[PDB]
């Protein structure tokens, strides 16, 4: 347990072995204390010395200890990560990727992951210094299973951070260069590699349709759907986010998710005990029911309309809001027969019950859906029978309440629904 002052004295000794012992002491402070004194180490001026130790090819022990110390400094706040970058650490760590010692190479991988993890600017700076080619070179083996497990997890995680963040998204050419390795990782049977590989794919699909397309073109949707059914929540969470991202794209991109068999997983996703899974699954459904009528029909055929009735009836409120969107999208683009089916499944009562929500947006969304359903009933001449159903379950009074509702945008719909179907 050295003091920072003694570490400084050791590192200033210009005795390589004294410097190694002091760098190890610094590593132990940074790795073993519960509040490690990162700012004290930075204020002491040690980062430039640590960075210069990364180049001591003749003393691989001090390369490792300084790489570890700098890794942990870079794991902190953006200002602490910036201190590491400002000391010249990026090119030094990239050079260390070529070390013949796997534990040192791996430590450089980890440190670069922390730097890129800070945000898009340091991510793009790591890329501009040329990290991608040597990172990918470490994974250029015929079978990933011959690599050490911890080593492969660290590389996967660092590559996922190079895929991470928007404003801006990563450079298109970097994504194109990383994707084949990422795809291979996505097929590797280590649950931690799979989780982080899924996380990377979820970042790359979180963008415009052109970004979605370069992922979908690599043929990963069947594997994402397989991972969608995993037992490990750390895998299902990013797989579902990536699937949800993809169906925000074109109808054709959405069709590849359906073709791959994703909808057969949604009975369990839409009833999942983890609130966030249910919410994301219902969000995903809302962007599928915003699709074509044949895509709505596959939602019907897989039996998912009763599950949407269920989440609308009872779920966390944010999940109920996504379900209200799913219904408004369904009623907006569905056929009359599909909308009739929705009503037969019991959508009206849970829809009316949510008109008591304090949230203004969900009220708007629901009234829109009710408008769409009446439009279907107009083409069948059944507008009265529906207004009976709505009054029968107490929905008519909530319509009455809402044309005294403060917000600008509930009146015109309450108003009009009454003028047309209730007076």
């Amino acid at each position: 347990n050295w003091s920072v002052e003694d570490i400084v004295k050791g590192i200033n000794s210009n005795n390589l072995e004294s410097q190694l012992q002091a760098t190890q002491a610094a590593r132990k402070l940074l790795s073993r204390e519960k509040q490690p004194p990162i700012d004290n180490i930075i204020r002491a001026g040690l980062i430039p010395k640590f960075v210069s130790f990364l180049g001591k090819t003749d003393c691989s022990p001090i390369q490792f200890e300084s790489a570890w110390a700098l890794t942990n400094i870079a794991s902190g706040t953006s200002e602490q990560t910036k201190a590491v970058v400002d000391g010249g650490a990026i090119p030094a760590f990239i050079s260390l990727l070529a070390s013949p010692h796997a534990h040192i190479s791996e430590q450089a991988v980890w440190a670069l992951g922390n730097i890129a993890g800070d945000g898009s600017a340091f991510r793009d700076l790591v890329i501009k210094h040329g990290a991608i080619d040597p990172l990918l070179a470490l994974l250029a083996v015929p079978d990933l299973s011959t690599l050490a497990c911890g080593y492969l997890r660290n590389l996967t995680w660092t590559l996922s951070n190079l895929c991470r963040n928007k404003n801006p998204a990563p450079p298109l050419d970097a994504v194109e260069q990383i994707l084949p390795t990422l795809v291979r990782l996505l097929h590797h049977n280590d649950p931690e590699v799979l989780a982080d590989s899924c996380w990377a794919i979820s970042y790359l699909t979180d963008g415009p349709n052109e970004r979605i397309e370069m992922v979908v073109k690599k043929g990963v949707v069947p594997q994402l759907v397989k991972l969608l059914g995993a037992t490990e929540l750390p895998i299902v969470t990013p797989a579902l986010r990536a699937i949800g991202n993809i169906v925000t794209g074109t109808d054709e991109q959405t069709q590849k998710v359906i073709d791959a068999g994703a909808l057969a997983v949604f009975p369990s996703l839409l009833t999942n005990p983890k609130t966030n899974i249910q919410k994301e699954a219902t969000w995903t459904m809302s962007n599928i029911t915003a699709g074509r009528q044949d895509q709505i029909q596959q939602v019907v055929n897989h039996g998912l309309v009763p599950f949407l009735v269920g989440v609308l009836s009872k779920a966390d409120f944010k999940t109920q809001k996504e379900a209200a969107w799913a219904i408004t999208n369904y009623t907006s683009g569905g056929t009359v027969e599909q909308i009739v089916y929705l009503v037969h499944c019991g959508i009206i009562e849970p829809l009316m019950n949510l008109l008591s929500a304090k949230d203004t947006k969900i009220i708007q969304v629901i009234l829109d859906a009710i408008s769409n359903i009446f439009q279907a009933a107009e083409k069948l001449g059944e507008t009265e029978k529906l207004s009976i159903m709505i009054e029968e379950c107490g929905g008519l009074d909530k319509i009455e309440a809402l044309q005294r509702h403060e917000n600008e945008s509930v009146y015109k719909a309450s108003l009009n629904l009454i003028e047309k179907y209730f007076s």
Binding site: D206, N245, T248, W283, S286, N287, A290, G291, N329
Partner: peptide, 6 residues
């Protein structure tokens, strides 16, 4: 029927 990100 519009898709909502993200």
């Amino acid at each position: 029927p519009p898709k909502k990100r993200a």
